[PDB]
Amino acid sequence: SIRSLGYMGFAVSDVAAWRSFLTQKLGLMEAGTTDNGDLFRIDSRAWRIAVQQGEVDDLAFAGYEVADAAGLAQMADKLKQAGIAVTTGDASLARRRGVTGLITFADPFGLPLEIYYGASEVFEKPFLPGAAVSGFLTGEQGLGHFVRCVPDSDKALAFYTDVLGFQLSDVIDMKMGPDVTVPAYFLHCNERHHTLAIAAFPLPKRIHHFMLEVASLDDVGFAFDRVDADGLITSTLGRHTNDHMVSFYASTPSGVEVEYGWSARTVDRSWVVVRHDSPSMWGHKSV
């Protein structure tokens, strides 16, 4: 089974702008440039986010991590049983991603996805943030989460749940006007409240935002100010109703947003599905 979101790749029009934003604003660590593009770290892994030159200015691909080779084989079988076109990543791609093995495919709406095992650790190159950040929260919870924008949430939900094995945490019926209410589904694959959210929003991108979690409230507070200095804040500090994460949102150079948060609650086998009519307990005022 999939254990977590392991990495993400972005294809952007302004690579230099993304380099500055990720390091100076968010505090990620520059980790070199390879055939995989500019690499960025948040922990012991060789890379978590890759930035390549591209006109889409959007998420180019996402990689989900399994525990081992057997886990990869099981997922490949499940995908093919579901009629999904699966391709074994050649040695060249595995090297580019720095993984031992991987398979590639796309979700129902074209997002390139990868499932891999045996990623590269670089403890000998101790993580040093590009900005003052006490630390990022990863471990068994993986990289964080992102919100997949789709045309049909039911079809997307069925794929991620029935085929990829994600489990529902909760639903938030997002009010988008007196005559518009869209359900947002939050799914987990580990203790992180959600690793993936699905919603039918009127956005021209594959995702609304990706989220990175930090170790302290000050990490969030300082980052907010660094981002605000450039007028990139899209939402004030607030706490979510479902995962109870305290965060703010900001614009990346590609328009896609990034959520930066702290203190979210986790889920387990005793968790029960619930619904909400608001996404924020307090704060998160649109600006």
The interface partner of residue 225, options being a second copy, Fe ion, ligand BP6, none and the CB cut-off 5 to 8 Å by kind, is: a second copy
- The residue (of 11 and 171) whose beta carbon lies closer to a second copy is 171
The answer to the question of residue 50 lying near Fe ion (CB under 5 A) is: no
Q: Which is nearer to Fe ion, 80 or 275 (CB)?
A: 275
**277 counts as binding a second copy under rule CB under 8 A:** yes
Q: Does 228 bind a second copy (CB under 8 A)?
A: yes
176 binds a second copy (CB under 8 A): no
Segment interacting with a second copy, rule: CB under 8 A, options 9-17, 53-61, 79-87, 117-125: 117-125
Nearest approach in angstroms of CB 182 to a second copy is 16
Contact code string over 65-104 relative to a second copy, x by CB under 8 A? xxxxx----------------------------xxx----
Nearer to Fe ion, 36 or 195 (CB): 195
Give the residues lining the site for ligand BP6 (CB under 6 A). Answer: 147, 172, 184, 197, 199, 203-205, 208, 211, 234, 240, 242-243, 245, 254-257, 259, 279-280, 284
- By CB under 5 A, name the one of 66, 137, 211, 220 that touches Fe ion: 211
Contact yes or no for 179/129 (Cβ under 8 A) = no
CB of 278 to a second copy, least distance (A): 4
Nearer to ligand BP6, 256 or 267 (CB): 256
Question: Residues with Cβ < 8 Å from 87, sequence gap 6 or more?
Answer: 103, 104, 105
* Contacts for 150-158: CB closer than 8 Å, 24+ residues apart: 150/108, 150/109, 150/198, 150/199, 150/200, 151/109, 151/200, 152/200, 153/182, 153/183, 153/185, 153/198, 153/199, 153/200, 155/108, 156/107, 156/108, 156/109, 156/198, 157/185, 157/198
In this structure, which amino acid lies at residue 187?
L
Q: Name the residue type at position 131.
A: A
Residue 213 near residue 250 (C-beta atoms within 8 A): no
Please work out, in degrees rounded to the nearest 5, the angle formed at the alpha carbon of residue 48 by the alpha carbons of 195 and 82: 50
Q: How far apart are CA 11 and CA 42, in angstroms?
A: 19
CA 111 – CA 148 distance, rounded (Å): 9
Neighbours of 77 (CB within 10 A): 11
Interface with a second copy (CB under 8 A)? 3, 65-69, 98-100, 117-124, 126-129, 131-132, 140, 168, 170-171, 217-218, 221-222, 224-225, 228, 236-239, 241-242, 244, 246, 270-278, 280-283, 285
